[PDB]
Amino acid sequence: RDVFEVFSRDGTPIRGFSRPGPGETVVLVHGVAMDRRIWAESGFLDALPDAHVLALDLRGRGESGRVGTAEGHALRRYVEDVRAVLDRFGRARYSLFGTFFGGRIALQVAAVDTRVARAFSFCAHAEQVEIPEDAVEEEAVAVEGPGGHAYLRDHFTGRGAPPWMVEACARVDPGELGAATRGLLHGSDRRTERGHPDQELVLITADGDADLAPFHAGERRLGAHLWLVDAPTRIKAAGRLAEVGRRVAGVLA
Ligand SMILES: COC(=O)C[C@@H](NC(=O)[C@@H](NC(=O)[C@@H](/N=C1/NCC(=O)N2CC[C@@H](C)[C@H]2C(=O)N[C@@H](CCSC)C(=O)N[C@H]1C(C)(C)C)C(C)(C)C)[C@@H](C)c1ccccc1)c1nccs1
């Protein structure tokens, strides 16, 4: 692997690694309480032996620049972070894969960037959502205080999340966990659109998902394909991420 640095529209440095390969160029986008290490720890990276893999730390996470404001964590800023990575490696065609809110980010990048030939959203759909202001603020307070890492650790452990997902929360600054949570009130509630007719859009979730409705809505509205994994919940579906990587490798082949 080589490391890289790019700059987002608002000047935030975005750091990541590039794993060279002769195949498709794949850009991986992690979730809120994660960083770029989850791709190797989940086994997703090893499931793609031929791809040229680009994995970034989103703003405020890992080795990327700190933010510390709610508006600095607006969805549009994450989109700009990812598009800056697409610029650095100069390809005309990219395949994006994102986990949880990283899936929402990947879908929105696909909507605005004609260089995205494929977008895969793992355990997130593309539809408009209602975000309760009070509950999200409550959650921001819980995750940003001294007990925030334990709060997330206990929540994810209790819901059967994989160990790498539990452990990743403690590597995110508490202040950025709070700011990213509040950032969801700045645009993340809108649906995503199809970027161009030839795009391959894929949604993935647990076959036991208690709310599959919006995933089917994405099939109808965007012409997206729906992949299911054997799990009772979205969090437990994260235990299937390496398996999903193998299926992604099949598409890329
Ligand atoms: C069944 O599976 C789930 O619904 C859990 C799953 N979530 C999601 O898939 C999506 N979101 C949600 O459905 C809801 N959103 C919340 N809060 C905003 C939010 O998302 N977060 C804040 C902290 C950050 C870790 C992240 C999060 O995960 N929080 C958890 C609680 C974890 S600690 C007690 C959490 O869901 N809370 C809820 C409360 C309202 C209860 C506070 C609404 C309001 C959007 C419908 C998420 C991908 C998204 C999708 C589109 C736009 C924005 C965000 C995940 N669990 C861990 C990783 S992804």
Side-chain angles (χ1 to χ4, degrees):
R1 303 175 200 173
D2 290 18
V3 298
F4 69 80
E5 163 178 278
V6 303
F7 288 83
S8 197
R9 173 177 174 85
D10 72 358
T12 304
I14 299 299
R15 280 60 173 255
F17 71 75
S18 159
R19 200 288 305 278
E24 296 291 84
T25 310
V26 181
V27 183
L28 307 178
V29 186
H30 62 73
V32 172
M34 300 180 177
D35 58 27
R36 75 196 199 212
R37 285 199 234 167
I38 62 101
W39 302 110
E41 296 189 3
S42 70
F44 188 91
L45 186 60
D46 182 29
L48 302 171
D50 295 331
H52 178 195
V53 175
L54 307 171
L56 72 154
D57 288 320
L58 288 171
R59 57 182 51 219
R61 269 57 60 90
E63 297 163 36
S64 290
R66 303 328 194 207
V67 184
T69 66
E71 183 64 23
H73 281 272
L75 171 60
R76 63 168 294 236
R77 299 302 184 191
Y78 296 148
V79 171
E80 286 156 5
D81 295 346
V82 175
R83 297 185 77 185
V85 174
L86 308 190
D87 290 350
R88 165 142 191 175
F89 293 92
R91 309 310 209 281
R93 168 175 86 265
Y94 291 97
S95 296
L96 314 189
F97 186 104
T99 55
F100 296 103
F101 194 68
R104 301 280 290 193
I105 298 167
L107 288 166
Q108 178 58 20
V109 178
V112 301
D113 197 309
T114 54
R115 294 171 297 182
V116 175
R118 309 188 183 86
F120 304 82
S121 180
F122 180 80
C123 290
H125 59 72
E127 303 312 292
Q128 186 175 315
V129 295
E130 291 184 349
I131 297 180
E133 282 192 333
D134 62 322
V136 167
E137 176 59 31
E138 181 188 7
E139 185 137 277
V141 170
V143 301
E144 74 188 355
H149 288 155
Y151 172 87
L152 288 175
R153 180 181 308 118
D154 296 343
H155 183 258
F156 285 136
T157 300
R159 281 155 183 262
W164 59 261
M165 183 167 168
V166 177
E167 294 162 8
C169 306
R171 299 198 298 271
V172 186
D173 294 347
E176 301 288 9
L177 289 170
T181 297
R182 296 193 181 88
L184 299 171
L185 306 180
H186 294 276
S188 83
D189 65 350
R190 291 186 179 175
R191 77 195 189 191
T192 69
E193 307 291 345
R194 166 173 285 275
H196 53 271
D198 293 338
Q199 280 187 329
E200 301 175 25
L201 304 175
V202 173
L203 311 176
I204 308 136
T205 191
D207 68 335
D209 194 321
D211 191 26
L212 278 174
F215 286 88
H216 292 307
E219 289 177 290
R220 305 191 299 276
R221 187 176 59 82
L222 300 176
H225 308 286
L226 179 58
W227 297 359
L228 298 178
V229 298
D230 175 61
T233 62
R234 289 179 197 168
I235 284 175
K236 279 174 175 175
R240 303 292 183 187
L241 191 51
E243 183 177 359
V244 171
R246 287 203 294 284
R247 192 166 175 181
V248 172
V251 173
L252 302 179

